[PDB]
Backbone as a printed PyTorch tensor [residue, N CA C, xyz], in Angstrom:
tensor([[[124.6770,   2.6240,  57.4110],
         [123.5850,   3.5180,  58.5290],
         [122.7570,   3.2610,  59.3030]],

        [[121.9390,   2.1200,  57.7870],
         [119.6260,   0.9920,  58.9070],
         [120.5090,   0.6510,  60.2990]],

        [[122.1280,   0.4270,  60.4940],
         [121.8520,  -0.6550,  61.7310],
         [122.8440,  -0.6400,  62.4550]],

        [[123.1610,   0.5490,  62.3970],
         [123.7570,   1.5040,  63.3100],
         [123.4950,   1.5570,  64.9280]],

        [[124.4830,   1.1210,  65.3980],
         [124.5610,   1.4010,  66.8230],
         [123.7930,   2.1620,  67.4350]],

        [[123.2150,   3.6780,  66.9810],
         [123.0390,   4.2810,  66.8640],
         [120.9680,   3.5600,  67.6300]],

        [[121.0500,   2.4530,  67.6120],
         [119.9720,   1.8490,  67.2700],
         [119.8800,   1.4100,  68.8100]],

        [[121.3270,   1.2240,  69.2140],
         [121.7580,   1.2130,  70.6900],
         [121.3000,   1.7720,  71.6440]],

        [[121.5790,   2.7040,  71.0350],
         [121.5990,   3.8960,  72.0340],
         [120.0540,   4.5200,  72.5280]],

        [[119.1800,   3.9460,  71.1200],
         [118.0390,   4.3860,  71.8440],
         [117.3040,   3.3690,  72.0480]],

        [[117.4980,   2.3640,  72.2880],
         [117.2890,   0.9600,  73.4510],
         [117.1640,   1.5120,  74.3850]],

        [[118.3480,   1.6360,  75.1110],
         [118.8290,   1.8100,  75.8330],
         [118.5270,   3.0390,  76.9170]],

        [[118.6580,   4.1640,  75.7050],
         [117.6210,   5.0500,  76.3770],
         [115.9130,   4.9230,  77.0950]],

        [[115.5230,   4.0890,  75.5960],
         [113.7800,   3.3670,  76.4940],
         [113.9360,   2.7470,  77.5050]],

        [[114.7060,   2.0310,  77.5490],
         [114.8880,   1.5430,  78.6660],
         [115.1730,   1.7780,  79.8700]],

        [[115.7350,   2.9890,  80.0210],
         [115.7890,   3.3120,  81.1000],
         [114.0930,   4.4020,  81.4910]],

        [[113.7630,   5.2600,  80.6440],
         [112.8610,   5.7440,  79.8450],
         [111.5150,   4.8710,  80.6600]],

        [[111.1220,   3.5970,  80.3980],
         [110.5970,   3.4690,  81.1460],
         [110.5240,   2.4550,  82.1250]],

        [[111.0770,   2.6350,  82.6180],
         [111.4170,   3.1140,  83.8690],
         [111.3620,   3.6700,  85.4520]],

        [[110.7750,   4.8390,  84.9820],
         [110.0390,   5.7250,  85.5000],
         [108.4530,   5.9820,  84.8150]],

        [[107.7000,   5.8570,  85.6210],
         [106.4050,   6.4450,  85.5820],
         [106.3350,   7.8020,  85.7780]],

        [[104.9320,   7.9690,  86.3450],
         [104.6940,   9.3360,  86.9080],
         [102.8990,  10.2630,  86.4620]],

        [[102.7870,  11.7180,  87.0020],
         [101.9030,  12.4380,  86.5920],
         [102.7340,  12.8380,  85.1020]],

        [[103.9840,  13.0450,  85.5440],
         [104.2900,  13.2420,  83.6100],
         [104.4450,  12.3750,  82.9820]],

        [[103.8540,  10.7580,  82.9680],
         [104.3370,  10.4010,  81.8610],
         [102.6000,   9.6010,  81.5190]],

        [[102.1170,  10.2230,  82.3240],
         [100.6280,  10.2560,  82.0080],
         [ 99.9620,  10.6540,  80.9590]],

        [[101.0520,  11.9610,  80.5380],
         [100.4080,  13.3750,  79.9890],
         [100.9390,  13.1120,  78.5690]],

        [[ 99.8120,  13.5890,  77.7450],
         [ 99.8390,  12.5380,  76.2890],
         [100.7070,  12.9220,  74.9150]],

        [[100.5040,  12.4080,  74.2340],
         [102.1550,  12.7690,  72.9920],
         [100.4240,  12.4480,  71.6870]],

        [[100.8170,  12.8270,  70.5800],
         [ 99.8700,  12.4090,  69.3980],
         [101.0600,  11.2630,  69.0640]],

        [[ 99.3520,   9.8520,  68.4550],
         [ 99.6750,   8.6690,  69.1790],
         [100.3240,   8.5530,  67.2050]],

        [[101.5360,   9.2030,  66.9970],
         [101.9760,   8.5380,  65.6430],
         [101.7460,   6.8090,  65.6710]],

        [[101.0730,   5.8200,  66.5630],
         [101.0690,   4.8270,  65.8030],
         [ 99.6590,   4.0660,  65.7280]],

        [[ 99.4000,   5.4110,  65.3550],
         [ 97.5810,   5.1990,  64.9840],
         [ 97.1340,   5.1550,  63.8320]],

        [[ 98.4620,   5.7540,  62.9510],
         [ 98.4410,   5.1940,  61.7430],
         [ 98.0900,   3.7390,  61.3530]],

        [[ 97.6380,   3.8040,  60.0000],
         [ 97.0220,   2.5490,  59.4010],
         [ 98.6550,   3.2050,  58.6200]],

        [[100.0890,   3.3560,  58.8940],
         [100.5700,   2.6100,  58.9850],
         [101.6300,   3.1560,  57.3020]],

        [[101.2180,   4.1160,  56.3280],
         [102.2930,   4.4450,  55.0560],
         [103.0440,   4.5590,  54.9000]],

        [[103.9710,   4.3620,  55.2010],
         [105.6000,   5.6260,  56.2140],
         [106.4020,   4.6590,  56.0910]],

        [[107.8810,   5.3290,  55.4950],
         [108.9310,   5.3220,  55.6390],
         [109.9500,   4.7970,  56.5780]],

        [[110.7590,   4.2590,  56.9810],
         [111.5810,   4.4280,  58.1140],
         [112.2920,   5.8130,  58.8730]],

        [[112.0950,   5.7260,  58.0310],
         [113.0200,   7.5880,  57.7130],
         [111.6690,   8.8710,  58.4810]],

        [[110.7880,   8.7140,  57.9560],
         [109.4920,   9.0930,  58.6910],
         [109.0950,   8.8840,  59.5520]],

        [[109.3980,   7.1550,  59.9290],
         [108.6760,   7.2290,  61.1670],
         [109.6450,   7.7510,  62.6280]],

        [[111.0090,   7.6630,  62.2010],
         [111.3320,   8.1290,  63.3700],
         [111.5490,   9.4420,  63.0340]],

        [[111.9980,  10.4400,  62.1270],
         [110.9150,  11.6470,  62.6330],
         [109.5120,  12.3690,  63.4170]],

        [[108.6080,  11.7460,  62.6250],
         [107.1310,  11.8610,  63.3530],
         [107.6560,  11.5260,  64.6830]],

        [[108.5870,  10.5520,  65.4610],
         [108.7100,  10.3410,  66.5990],
         [109.3280,  11.0940,  67.7980]],

        [[110.3880,  11.4290,  66.8740],
         [111.7060,  12.8040,  67.2080],
         [110.6610,  13.9270,  67.3470]],

        [[109.5990,  14.5410,  66.8370],
         [108.6700,  15.4370,  66.7060],
         [107.4950,  15.6580,  67.6560]],

        [[106.7080,  14.4820,  67.8860],
         [106.1870,  14.3770,  69.0910],
         [106.6770,  14.7430,  70.6420]],

        [[107.8760,  13.8110,  70.2860],
         [108.8060,  13.5780,  71.9010],
         [109.2270,  15.1700,  72.0100]],

        [[109.5380,  15.5760,  70.9620],
         [110.1100,  17.2990,  70.9330],
         [108.9820,  18.0840,  71.5260]],

        [[107.5540,  18.0420,  71.2290],
         [106.6840,  18.9500,  71.5170],
         [106.5160,  18.4620,  72.9740]],

        [[106.9280,  17.2480,  73.5380],
         [106.1720,  16.4300,  74.5770],
         [107.6710,  17.2810,  75.7650]],

        [[108.2150,  16.7750,  75.2680],
         [109.7640,  17.6820,  76.3800],
         [109.7670,  19.3410,  76.6090]],

        [[109.4400,  19.9190,  75.6660],
         [109.1980,  20.6370,  74.8690],
         [108.1790,  21.9340,  76.0420]],

        [[107.1720,  21.1290,  75.9180],
         [105.7970,  21.3820,  76.4190],
         [105.9560,  21.3420,  77.9040]],

        [[106.8140,  20.3740,  78.9900],
         [107.0120,  19.9670,  80.1590],
         [107.8290,  20.2010,  81.2360]],

        [[108.6290,  20.7710,  80.1690],
         [110.4350,  20.6920,  81.2390],
         [109.8180,  21.4230,  82.2910]],

        [[109.1990,  22.4770,  82.2110],
         [108.6320,  23.4930,  83.1390],
         [107.6270,  23.3670,  84.0830]],

        [[107.0830,  22.4090,  83.5200],
         [105.7850,  21.9090,  84.0570],
         [104.7710,  21.6380,  84.9820]],

        [[104.3500,  22.4820,  85.6330],
         [104.9340,  21.7740,  87.8970],
         [103.9270,  21.0010,  88.0360]],

        [[102.6580,  20.6220,  87.1570],
         [102.3060,  19.1600,  86.7370],
         [103.4550,  18.1210,  87.1010]],

        [[104.6150,  18.1810,  86.7460],
         [105.6590,  17.5710,  86.5850],
         [107.4950,  18.1100,  87.5140]],

        [[107.3900,  18.9410,  87.6260],
         [108.6620,  19.4220,  87.8160],
         [108.6990,  18.2400,  89.8060]],

        [[107.9700,  18.1740,  90.4600],
         [107.9940,  17.6750,  91.6920],
         [108.2000,  18.6310,  93.2040]],

        [[107.2380,  17.5650,  94.1070],
         [107.4600,  18.5900,  94.9000],
         [108.1300,  18.1830,  95.8220]],

        [[108.9030,  16.8600,  95.8840],
         [110.4860,  15.8650,  96.2820],
         [111.4180,  15.9080,  96.2070]],

        [[112.6390,  16.0180,  96.9080],
         [113.8600,  15.6510,  95.8560],
         [113.9140,  14.5910,  94.7540]],

        [[113.3670,  13.6260,  95.3470],
         [113.3950,  12.7780,  94.4380],
         [112.3380,  12.6270,  93.1950]],

        [[111.4240,  13.4150,  93.0800],
         [110.3810,  13.6330,  92.1080],
         [111.6420,  14.3380,  91.0140]],

        [[111.4410,  15.1760,  91.9560],
         [112.5820,  17.3760,  90.5800],
         [113.4130,  16.0340,  90.4280]],

        [[114.7010,  14.9430,  91.0600],
         [115.2280,  14.3350,  90.2040],
         [114.2820,  13.7760,  88.6570]],

        [[114.0510,  13.0720,  89.3320],
         [113.3450,  11.5660,  88.0930],
         [112.7350,  12.8100,  86.6550]],

        [[112.0800,  13.8230,  87.1400],
         [111.6030,  14.7050,  85.9740],
         [112.8170,  14.9680,  85.4350]],

        [[113.9620,  16.0950,  85.5810],
         [114.9350,  16.2090,  85.2600],
         [115.4340,  14.6670,  84.4590]],

        [[115.7160,  14.0500,  84.8610],
         [116.2210,  12.8840,  83.9900],
         [115.1220,  12.4740,  83.5070]],

        [[113.6880,  12.5570,  83.4350],
         [112.5090,  11.6900,  82.1450],
         [113.8600,  12.7790,  80.7380]],

        [[113.7450,  14.3840,  81.1810],
         [113.7580,  15.5260,  80.4320],
         [114.8700,  15.0230,  78.9960]],

        [[116.5100,  14.6940,  80.2960],
         [117.3750,  14.6610,  79.9280],
         [116.7040,  13.4080,  78.9990]],

        [[116.7020,  12.5620,  79.3590],
         [116.3550,  11.2420,  78.5330],
         [115.9170,  11.1110,  77.2610]],

        [[114.1770,  11.9580,  77.7840],
         [113.3370,  12.1730,  76.2360],
         [114.9180,  13.1060,  75.1580]],

        [[115.4450,  14.2870,  75.8580],
         [116.5070,  15.2310,  74.8700],
         [117.1040,  14.3280,  74.3430]],

        [[117.3680,  12.9370,  75.2090],
         [118.4190,  12.3480,  74.6600],
         [118.4670,  11.4280,  73.2960]],

        [[117.1760,  10.5980,  73.4810],
         [116.1820,   9.3190,  72.7840],
         [115.5070,  10.7910,  71.2000]],

        [[115.7990,  11.7280,  71.7840],
         [114.7820,  12.0750,  70.4970],
         [116.4180,  13.1010,  69.6860]],

        [[117.9410,  12.8770,  69.8060],
         [119.4070,  13.7560,  69.0570],
         [119.3180,  12.5180,  68.1190]],

        [[118.9120,  11.0490,  68.8350],
         [119.1660,   9.9100,  68.7960],
         [118.2300,   9.7430,  66.9180]],

        [[117.1890,  10.1370,  67.5020],
         [116.2510,   9.6290,  66.3630],
         [116.2170,  10.7280,  65.1810]],

        [[116.6640,  12.1710,  65.4550],
         [117.0050,  12.9760,  64.5800],
         [117.8550,  12.8680,  63.4980]],

        [[119.0130,  11.8890,  64.4240],
         [119.9980,  11.4140,  63.6100],
         [119.4530,  10.2950,  63.0040]],

        [[118.4750,  10.0520,  62.7780],
         [118.4750,   8.4480,  62.5420],
         [117.4240,   9.0610,  60.5380]],

        [[116.5590,   9.6480,  61.1780],
         [115.7920,  10.6110,  60.4440],
         [116.6290,  10.8370,  58.9230]],

        [[117.1330,  11.8660,  59.4630],
         [117.5930,  12.4460,  58.2600],
         [116.5850,  13.6220,  57.5620]],

        [[115.9500,  13.7060,  58.8050],
         [114.4410,  14.8820,  57.8940],
         [114.1110,  15.3720,  59.3620]],

        [[113.7470,  17.1520,  58.6910],
         [112.4510,  17.9240,  59.7930],
         [110.7130,  17.5840,  58.6830]],

        [[110.5740,  17.5960,  57.8850],
         [109.4960,  17.4890,  57.2300],
         [108.6610,  15.9450,  57.4270]],

        [[107.7910,  16.1540,  58.1090],
         [106.7720,  14.6330,  58.7430],
         [105.8770,  15.6570,  59.5800]],

        [[104.7990,  16.1240,  59.1210],
         [103.8730,  16.3220,  59.6420],
         [102.8170,  15.3540,  60.7070]],

        [[102.6800,  15.3020,  61.6240],
         [102.0150,  14.6620,  62.1550],
         [100.6480,  14.4960,  62.6160]],

        [[ 99.2550,  14.0640,  61.4140],
         [ 97.9040,  14.1140,  61.4970],
         [ 97.1680,  13.4890,  62.4000]],

        [[ 97.7070,  12.1540,  63.8010],
         [ 97.1330,  11.7290,  64.2440],
         [ 96.2180,  12.1820,  65.2180]],

        [[ 94.2240,  12.2580,  65.3860],
         [ 93.4110,  12.3870,  66.4810],
         [ 94.3920,  12.3740,  68.0390]],

        [[ 94.4430,  10.6810,  67.6200],
         [ 94.6170,   9.6390,  68.9950],
         [ 95.6320,  10.2680,  69.6810]],

        [[ 95.6680,  10.4870,  70.9430],
         [ 96.3180,  10.7640,  72.3460],
         [ 96.8270,   9.2160,  72.5430]],

        [[ 98.0720,   9.9990,  72.9950],
         [ 98.2320,   8.2640,  74.4930],
         [ 98.9950,   8.9020,  74.7960]],

        [[ 99.3570,   8.3990,  76.1850],
         [100.1450,   8.0250,  76.6380],
         [101.4030,   8.0230,  76.6650]],

        [[102.5620,   8.7430,  77.2020],
         [103.9250,   8.9630,  76.7820],
         [105.0170,   7.7580,  77.5990]],

        [[103.6200,   7.2140,  78.3230],
         [104.4430,   5.6270,  79.1670],
         [104.1110,   5.0350,  77.7310]],

        [[103.4080,   4.7560,  77.0260],
         [102.3030,   3.8360,  76.3550],
         [102.8530,   3.6760,  74.3010]],

        [[103.1620,   5.9080,  74.6410],
         [103.9480,   5.7450,  73.1030],
         [105.5190,   4.9510,  73.5480]],

        [[105.8750,   5.5780,  74.6120],
         [107.6180,   4.5930,  74.3940],
         [107.7550,   3.3800,  74.2440]],

        [[106.7540,   2.3900,  74.8790],
         [107.0800,   1.3130,  75.4870],
         [106.0470,   0.8350,  73.3500]],

        [[105.8370,   1.3340,  72.8610],
         [105.2810,   0.7830,  71.6450],
         [106.8010,   1.3990,  70.3240]],

        [[107.0510,   2.5820,  70.9610],
         [108.9460,   3.2290,  70.2400],
         [110.3210,   1.5830,  70.5630]],

        [[109.6970,   1.2280,  72.2970],
         [110.5840,   0.4860,  71.9440],
         [110.4140,  -0.8110,  71.6900]],

        [[109.1810,  -1.8040,  71.4640],
         [109.1520,  -2.2580,  70.7510],
         [109.0640,  -2.7100,  68.7740]],

        [[109.2230,  -1.1910,  68.6750],
         [109.4960,  -0.6370,  67.0530],
         [110.9580,  -1.0270,  66.8140]],

        [[112.0590,  -0.0730,  67.6870],
         [113.2580,  -0.5530,  67.9640],
         [113.9930,  -2.1370,  68.3740]],

        [[113.0370,  -2.9280,  69.2770],
         [114.0700,  -4.1320,  69.2810],
         [114.1080,  -4.5690,  67.7100]],

        [[112.2300,  -4.4480,  67.5260],
         [112.5680,  -4.7670,  66.3230],
         [113.0400,  -4.9550,  65.0530]],

        [[113.4540,  -3.3190,  65.1430],
         [114.7270,  -2.9220,  64.1660],
         [115.6560,  -3.6800,  64.2880]],

        [[116.7490,  -3.4550,  65.6980],
         [117.6580,  -4.1730,  65.7880],
         [117.7720,  -5.8860,  65.4330]],

        [[116.2630,  -6.5880,  65.8670],
         [116.3180,  -7.6650,  65.7540],
         [116.3390,  -8.2110,  64.1280]],

        [[115.4500,  -7.5510,  63.7180],
         [116.2010,  -7.7470,  62.1420],
         [117.2000,  -7.1780,  60.8690]],

        [[118.2090,  -6.5380,  62.6360],
         [119.3370,  -5.9500,  62.2220],
         [120.4430,  -6.8770,  61.8190]],

        [[120.3710,  -8.1330,  63.2700],
         [121.3380,  -8.8220,  63.5410],
         [121.0700, -10.9630,  63.8510]],

        [[122.1200, -11.3320,  63.7640],
         [121.7910, -12.8550,  63.2370],
         [120.2500, -13.0640,  64.5500]]])
């Protein structure tokens, strides 16, 4: 289970996510990576999933994010769809919902997604030859 292709699903989705920016992607999320890091792999996944669920829940219909143009609206819908897809995969990996996140620091969603991508690529690297 630890080295399941779900890791590839998460990475591919993070790649799609980090290739769009926006007013939306500068809005913030609680920075689970600001911890001094006393945390199981499963607890990290639950944490990341929780904050991302907070984000897409809060901003799916946010007027700052919805967009004026057809293109901006499309990219918003794509962001929300990909955040849900990423979240679905993260919860599947976590096998958990009870993971309080206590961090004060907020980071932009963009910065949080890049950090998560780094962590996930490292996991992938640690799984393969």
